[PDB]
């Protein structure tokens, strides 16, 4: 009954955002709550933020 098929592939980029589920290898799952600014995150003596 069908004489032609056309398949189209769409590629999209998903970036991390609040609500996305992230976890480690030890079962410590969780959801992103806030994307803190770089200057608001805690930093060490050398000034490198976590």
């Amino acid at each position: 009954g069908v004489l032609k098929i056309v398949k189209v592939y769409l590629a999209v980029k998903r970036r991390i955002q609040p609500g996305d589920k992230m976890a480690g290898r030890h079962g410590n799952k969780g959801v992103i709550s806030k994307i803190n600014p770089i200057e608001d995150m805690p930093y060490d003596e050398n000034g490198t933020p976590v």
Binding site: L3, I5, V6, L10
Partner: protein
Amino acid sequence: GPEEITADIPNVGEAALSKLDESGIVYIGAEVTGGDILVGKVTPKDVKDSSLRVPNGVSGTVIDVQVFTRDGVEKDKRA
């Protein structure tokens, strides 16, 4: 009758077919959003709209188009 994949679409503007080529298939690498026409197909009733459209809330870039044609049926330019 047999439906066909064609460039023009009834009761639509020219900007809708900007992404579509002369064969009625969206250009590879063309950015599309929800509601945009991907493959222009019409079905005789003179004809009614049956063209494939991007689902709502879905975006991205067209990276691959595959055309499968039954034996005996003519192959378009894209194929």
